[PDB]
Each structure stands twice: as structure tokens, then as C-alpha cells.
Amino acid sequence: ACPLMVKVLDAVRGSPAINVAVHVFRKAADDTWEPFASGKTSESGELHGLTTEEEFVEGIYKVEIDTKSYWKALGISPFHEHAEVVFTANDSGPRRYTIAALLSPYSYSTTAVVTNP
Amino acid sequence: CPLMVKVLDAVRGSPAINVAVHVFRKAADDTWEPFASGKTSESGELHGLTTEEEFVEGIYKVEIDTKSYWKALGISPFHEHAEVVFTANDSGPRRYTIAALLSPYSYSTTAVVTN
Amino acid sequence: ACPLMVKVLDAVRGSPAINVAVHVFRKAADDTWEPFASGKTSESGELHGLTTEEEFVEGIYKVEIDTKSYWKALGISPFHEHAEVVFTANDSGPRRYTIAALLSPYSYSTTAVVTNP
Amino acid sequence: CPLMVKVLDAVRGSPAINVAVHVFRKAADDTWEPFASGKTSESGELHGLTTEEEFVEGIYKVEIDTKSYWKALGISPFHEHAEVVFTANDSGPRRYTIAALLSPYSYSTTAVVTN
Numbered sequence: 001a002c003p004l005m006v007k008v009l010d011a012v013r014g015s016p017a018i019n020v021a022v023h024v025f026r027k028a029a030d031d032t033w034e035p036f037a038s039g040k041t042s043e044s045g046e047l048h049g050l051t052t053e054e055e056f057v058e059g060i061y062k063v064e065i066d067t068k069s070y071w072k073a074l075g076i077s078p079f080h081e082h083a084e085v086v087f088t089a090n091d092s093g094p095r096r097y098t099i100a101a102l103l104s105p106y107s108y109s110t111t112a113v114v115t116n117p
Numbered sequence: 118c119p120l121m122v123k124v125l126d127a128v129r130g131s132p133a134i135n136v137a138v139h140v141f142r143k144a145a146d147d148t149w150e151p152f153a154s155g156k157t158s159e160s161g162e163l164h165g166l167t168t169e170e171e172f173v174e175g176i177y178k179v180e181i182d183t184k185s186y187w188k189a190l191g192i193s194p195f196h197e198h199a200e201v202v203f204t205a206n207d208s209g210p211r212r213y214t215i216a217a218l219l220s221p222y223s224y225s226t227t228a229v230v231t232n
Numbered sequence: 233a234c235p236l237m238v239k240v241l242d243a244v245r246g247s248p249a250i251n252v253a254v255h256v257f258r259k260a261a262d263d264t265w266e267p268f269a270s271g272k273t274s275e276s277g278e279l280h281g282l283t284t285e286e287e288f289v290e291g292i293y294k295v296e297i298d299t300k301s302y303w304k305a306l307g308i309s310p311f312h313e314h315a316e317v318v319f320t321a322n323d324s325g326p327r328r329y330t331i332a333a334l335l336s337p338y339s340y341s342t343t344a345v346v347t348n349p
Numbered sequence: 350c351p352l353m354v355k356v357l358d359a360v361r362g363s364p365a366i367n368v369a370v371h372v373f374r375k376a377a378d379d380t381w382e383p384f385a386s387g388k389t390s391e392s393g394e395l396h397g398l399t400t401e402e403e404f405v406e407g408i409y410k411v412e413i414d415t416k417s418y419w420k421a422l423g424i425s426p427f428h429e430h431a432e433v434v435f436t437a438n439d440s441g442p443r444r445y446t447i448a449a450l451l452s453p454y455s456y457s458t459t460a461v462v463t464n
């Protein structure tokens with residue numbers, strides 16, 4: 001019953017991207033981004049436990065993935081500052097969201113898998 | 118031009134036409150000051166955003182209005198938009214092409230930077 | 233200890249791609265593709281149990297994913313006949329391979345995550 | 350031309366230059382008969398593979414020699430190559446651009462088909 005999971009993979013090494021910082025924000029009624037949760041990717045490149053079913057109410061959310069630090073630490077100066085995912089959540093009732101990102105120094109892809117528990 | 122944006126549609130196998138694109142420059146106060154905008158052409162390209170003089174070093178944001186594009190096609194989208202944030206010109210002036218490949222629940226962006 | 237897993241996701245629906253046929257082949261000493269394993273993706277879009285550590289000897293392998301049937305069944309005539317992954321395996325000792333594919337009607341991406349148990 | 354192939358490098362943020370590409374047509378016996386080939390240009394493009402007359406309906410294979418490209422750059426690659434298999438012209442003649450974005454452990458291909 002974790003309703004939000006983020007998973008990050010490295011397209012160069014063919015590996016999970018470990019220790020990647022992730023910050024999650026929620027758009028406020030006044031229209032600004034309130035901090036909602038944060039964490040770092042595990043060995044498996046996954047970040048669990050960000051939120052709960054109750055807390056994770058309808059809204060617009062932003063997941064910012066600190067790809068730049070991940071590359072810089074490997075000696076690489078990447079193109080992007082970060083990878084950002086912005087989406088409306090739970091608009092038709094609660095769902096479970098997996099936000100997956102695949103990283104290369106000059107490219108990233110992002111895909112959402114959304115399921116109905 | 119020093120900056121071009123090009124958008125493709127993975128569902129139809131075509132350029133993504135009439136997609137709104139906004140470009141911003143990060144301000145001293147860490148706000149985004151809007152800088153240039155346009156809509157992609159019938160080839161999915163947006164040219165003429167900026168000039169070599171104007172396009173000085175800094176951190177830039179390209180915001181692509183993916184949601185409106187999908188809505189227009191009658192297809193439900195996941196993302197609000199697709200954003201590309203990058204530092205420009207850090208080693209000199211370059212020509213940047215920002216390319217995006219769009220699916221309703223996924224997108225991929227790549228930069229082709231040539232000097 | 234499953235050394236080969238294939239995972240397929242649908243970029244249109246934001247879902248696993250279920251019931252996707254997958255065929256695996258191994259290049260023979262005579263240079264032709266011998267059938268090695270086959271299966272279909274589960275509800276979670278994953279296919280496990282293709283092979284074993286002992287069977288999965290060094291070689292060149294091909295994973296063919298029947299994307300066309302997956303789309304056609306949804307009413308869609310897709311661009312690709314299939315998605316094929318060809319790779320050398322276990323060249324430096326045994327590894328565990330996850331072959332992931334993300335599908336759209338006119339595009340697919342494939343990524344390998346390779347780990348050392 | 351009715352068929353173009355374009356290859357980009359996600360590691361360097363550049364066109365992938367001097368990449369070998371082979372094109373095949375499926376034969377009656379379900380073998381691949383090699384049809385056209387080339388190497389990508391400094392812009393990552395390969396033009397001139399075929400002509401409208403020659404490019405009749407059928408099933409075609411495009412094989413991109415990704416492995417050699419990475420080897421040349423000194424980077425270890427996962428794939429032997431990247432293949433694109435598709436049926437051409439089923440609704441009429443079209444112009445096909447096959448685009449590939451390459452990373453050492455990943456690739457993505459997309460078709461832009463215009464009539």
C-alpha cells in the first residue's frame with residue numbers, strides 16, 4: 001500500500017541508479033509547490049515509502065530527480081539539471097503510481113505505470 | 118539558431134504539430150523568467166526562439182505542453198507537461214536541439230549539441 | 233536464481249503489457265538461431281522462469297517480443313513486426329539479465345539491467 | 350527518398366556518425382535478402398537507400414551496427430545490434446524515417462511516417 005514509488009535506471013551501465021536524490025512537491029491552493037516528501041534511491045534504484053494512501057490526496061504533484069549529481073559523481077557533466085515529472089494524481093480515485101526514469105548523460109525517459117489496487 | 122526544439126508523436130508516428138513550447142531563463146532570485154515561445158510546425162520543429170547574442174550562459178527551461186496536445190487528439194495523458202532544464206553554453210556557445218518523443222504515459226528527451 | 237527475466241510496459245495506457253508472447257533463441261555453433269525458451273507476459277508484464285543458471289551458458293541470445301499481436305488485439309496496426317533484443321550473455325561469468333521493453337504503436341525502447349548475484 | 354535512417358548518441362549528445370546500417374527485405378522463403386546499406390553521416394543520417402520504384406510493399410529489416418559504434422568509442426555495449434522490422438507501404442507509399450537513440454545498455458527506435 002505504497003501509492004507512490006520512483007525507480008531510476010542507468011542506461012550506460014545497465015544498472016539501477018543508486019543513491020539518487022528525489023524530491024516530491026504538491027501544488028498548493030495558492031498555486032505554489034509545497035514540499036511533500038523526499039528520499040534517495042536504494043541499491044535497487046527504487047524509492048519507497050514516500051507517502052501513504054491517506055496523505056496522497058488528489059492533486060498535482062512534481063517529482064524532481066537529481067540526475068545531475070548522479071552523473072557528476074561518476075565524473076560526468078550531463079546535459080540536464082534534473083528530471084522532473086509533473087502529474088495529476090488520484091483524479092478518479094486512488095491509484096498506485098510507479099514513476100520510472102531511465103538515465104543517460106544527454107537523455108532521459110520517463111514512464112508511469114498506474115494501477116488500480 | 119542556437120536553440121531548436123523538435124517534438125515527435127510515438128502513437129501516430131509523426132511529428133507532433135502545433136505543440137506549445139515556452140522557454141524560460143533562471144533569474145537571479147531563482148525564479149523563471151519567460152524568455153521565448155512558439156508552436157511546433159508541421160515538421161514538429163520550432164525554430165527562431167533566440168539569437169546568439171541573447172542566448173548567453175545560464176540555466177534554461179523548456180516547457181512543452183504535452184497535455185494540450187494529447188487532449189486535442191482525444192487521448193488521456195499522464196503528464197501535465199514535459200520540462201527540460203539545462204545549463205547553456207558553459208564551454209562556449211553551442212547549437213542545441215532539444216528533441217522530445219511523446220507517448221501518453223511516457224516521454225523521452227534528448228539533446229543534440231553541436232559546436 | 234532466474235538468470236533471465238523480460239518485462240514489458242505499455243506507454244499508451246501506463247500499464248504492464250499483459251499476455252505478450254516472447255521467444256528466446258541461442259545462436260548455434262553453426263551460426264543459426266536455435267529455439268531456447270518461450271513464454272507470455274503475466275499480469276504484471278513480467279516473464280519469469282525462462283531458463284536456469286546451468287542451462288544459460290555463454291552465448292549470443294535473441295529475445296523476440298511479439299509487439300504486433302499485442303497492438304493488433306487492441307485494434308491497432310503498429311509500425312513494428314516485433315521487438316528484438318540480441319546480446320552476448322555471460323561473457324565474463326554468470327549474470328542476471330532483465331530485459332525491459334516499453335511499447336508504443338510507432339516506437340519501442342529497450343533496456344537491460346544486468347546484475348552480478 | 351522513401352526511407353531514411355537517423356541515429357543519435359545519448360551519451361555524447363550528438364549524432365552518431367559512421368554507424369553501419371544494413372537493410373533487408375524478407376524473401377518468399379522467409380529469409381532476409383540484403384537490399385541496401387550505408388554509414389551514417391556527420392549529421393547521423395543515412396539517405397539514398399532506395400527509390401520509390403524499388404521500395405515496394407513488403408517486410409523490411411533495418412540493422413544498425415551499434416556494437417561497432419560503441420567499440421570505436423571505447424565503451425562497453427550490451428546489444429549486438431539494433432534491429433527494426435516493419436511492413437512497408439501497406440496503405441500506399443509513404444516516406445519513412447527510422448530514428449534510433451543509442452545508449453550502451455539501451456536503445457529506442459521510432460518511426461516517423463509521412464505521406
Ligand SMILES: O=C1C[C@@H](c2ccc(O)cc2)Oc2cc(O)cc(O)c21
Pocket residue numbers: 007009098100101102109110111113223224225239241330332334341343344345
Ligand atoms: O529496466 C527498466 C527500464 C525502465 C524505463 C523504460 C522506459 C522509460 O521511458 C522509462 C523507464 O522501464 C522499467 C520500468 C520498470 O517498472 C522496471 C524496469 O526494470 C524498467
Ligand SMILES: O=C1C[C@@H](c2ccc(O)cc2)Oc2cc(O)cc(O)c21
Pocket residue numbers: 123125214216217218225227228229339340341355357448449450457458459
Ligand atoms: O534527438 C533526437 C532523438 C530521436 C529519438 C528519440 C526517441 C526514440 O525512441 C527514437 C529516436 O528523435 C530525433 C529525431 C530527429 O529527427 C532529430 C533528432 O535530433 C532526434
Ligand SMILES: [Ca+2]
Pocket residue numbers: 172173174206207209210
Ligand atoms: Ca556563451
Ligand SMILES: [Ca+2]
Pocket residue numbers: 404405406438439441442
Ligand atoms: Ca506501395
